[PDB]
Amino acid sequence: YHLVDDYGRGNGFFDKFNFFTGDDPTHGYVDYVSRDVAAGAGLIGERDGRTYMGVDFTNPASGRGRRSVRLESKNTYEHGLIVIDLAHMPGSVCGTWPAFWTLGTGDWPYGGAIDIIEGVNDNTFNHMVLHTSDGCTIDNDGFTGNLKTSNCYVYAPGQDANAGCGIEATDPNSYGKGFNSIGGGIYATEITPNGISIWFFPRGSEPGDVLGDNPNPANWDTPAAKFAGGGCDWEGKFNAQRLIFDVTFCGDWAGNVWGIGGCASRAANCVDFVRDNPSAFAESYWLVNSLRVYAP
Ligand SMILES: OC[C@H]1O[C@@H](O[C@H]2[C@H](O)[C@@H](O)[C@H](O)O[C@@H]2CO)[C@H](O)[C@@H](O)[C@@H]1O
């Protein structure tokens, strides 16, 4: 592997993304704002050399929903290794649905999609998921996490629509609250014609070459998640991926599971909570040490 893109920081980092401002594809109670409005609302910036991307935790929400940003990289990658070092990620906040992921080019779901860091509400464990067209299932080995769903197809029979094929990390510090309390860590994601692997290195435990000029995944510990096997054409189900950061609220996932988990008591429904409790979302932010993409 060799470096192909060091995303830098602050404005140089933001220049590498298009800010999505359309209504949320996942129907959340979110108001994705432009870069200028986000900077004016303090949702994006630089914090001591780190890149910050958060949500409005000040104002009662109105309009489409609570203000946030969704950045989609201008560049795409066919195959490669995406390494992100985060000092902080959106917390395990009720009503939230943060995600750092990649989305293939072309019509959904034919380009495939990879959820590297994702969860909802008060989740504890990171949930790594793939989303593809039909004809793509994964094996049970080569990873430390626990497989929850094996079919990556958006309409896998018996699975909720777009639940995808997901593996749940075993470390309670792999997401939200726990992750932030340890000062974050590093998530490395490798995309090859034979599958996808995602490693989670909690702060301090990362390999010595993960942030360097030639990271070599082959020598790293077992990944937290691995998507591979003959039940999928890894090369054909995934085309060029673009990197995406977002934090939405309620919507298709978080809003539909709100009333069953531990957040149900905070409010009648997800929307009312997100609308009337701005201060709840102070922890819903990404704080990037670095984002580097490599190619074979
Ligand atoms: O987990 C069950 C839940 O899945 C929801 O789909 C999510 C999917 O899990 C997530 O990885 C993707 O990023 O967003 C979709 C939103 O549709 C599904 O919508 C729920 O009905 C279902 O209970």
Side-chain angles (χ1 to χ4, degrees):
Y1 283 103
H2 58 273
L3 183 72
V4 295
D5 254 323
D6 179 305
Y7 277 65
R9 61 175 194 281
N11 283 324
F13 177 107
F14 296 130
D15 285 344
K16 300 176 74 59
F17 296 82
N18 289 310
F19 280 56
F20 179 83
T21 55
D23 291 343
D24 180 29
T26 45
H27 315 106
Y29 183 60
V30 70
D31 178 20
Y32 286 136
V33 297
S34 68
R35 178 165 167 184
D36 286 10
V37 172
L43 309 193
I44 60 172
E46 200 179 307
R47 303 284 184 265
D48 298 293
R50 274 93 76 92
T51 301
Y52 173 102
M53 298 177 272
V55 309
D56 178 335
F57 68 100
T58 297
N59 313 110
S62 59
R64 302 194 285 193
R66 180 156 297 289
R67 298 182 308 167
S68 184
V69 295
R70 163 159 167 167
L71 291 70
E72 308 190 356
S73 69
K74 288 171 178 171
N75 295 160
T76 63
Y77 313 96
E78 283 288 330
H79 305 301
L81 173 69
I82 300 162
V83 186
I84 191 181
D85 180 339
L86 292 164
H88 191 282
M89 78 159 282
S92 305
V93 186
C94 285
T96 68
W97 180 359
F100 168 52
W101 56 296
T102 72
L103 170 69
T105 56
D107 305 321
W108 168 268
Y110 299 104
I114 305 166
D115 284 301
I116 301 162
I117 304 175
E118 179 182 39
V120 299
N121 305 316
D122 57 4
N123 274 11
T124 301
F125 307 102
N126 183 35
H127 204 143
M128 300 154 278
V129 201
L130 303 198
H131 300 292
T132 70
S133 48
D134 194 21
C136 185
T137 65
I138 60 180
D139 287 348
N140 301 317
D141 40 271
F143 59 80
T144 66
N146 288 302
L147 179 157
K148 302 306 255 62
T149 50
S150 50
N151 194 329
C152 311
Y153 175 39
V154 300
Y155 285 124
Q159 282 176 28
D160 293 277
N162 197 51
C165 53
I167 289 173
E168 190 173 56
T170 54
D171 190 337
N173 293 324
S174 67
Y175 179 89
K177 196 184 181 180
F179 178 94
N180 298 329
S181 75
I182 69 170
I186 297 170
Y187 265 98
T189 301
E190 177 181 56
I191 307 172
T192 76
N194 309 123
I196 295 158
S197 303
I198 295 170
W199 291 264
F200 166 51
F201 304 114
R203 186 57 59 201
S205 75
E206 71 276 9
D209 64 344
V210 74
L211 303 170
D213 308 312
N214 304 90
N216 181 355
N219 291 328
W220 301 343
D221 299 313
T222 304
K226 187 155 115 81
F227 311 80
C232 185
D233 169 12
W234 297 107
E235 186 65 319
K237 292 294 178 184
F238 293 81
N239 50 32
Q241 304 287 303
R242 59 179 184 291
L243 319 180
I244 304 179
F245 285 94
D246 79 57
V247 177
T248 189
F249 304 82
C250 306
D252 298 342
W253 186 3
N256 274 285
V257 301
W258 169 275
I260 70 163
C263 297
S265 57
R266 309 292 288 286
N269 53 67
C270 183
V271 175
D272 295 334
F273 181 69
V274 176
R275 181 195 61 235
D276 308 327
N277 299 274
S279 65
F281 312 100
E283 286 301 288
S284 306
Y285 68 97
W286 301 100
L287 190 56
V288 186
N289 278 323
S290 73
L291 172 58
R292 297 172 185 144
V293 185
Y294 305 76

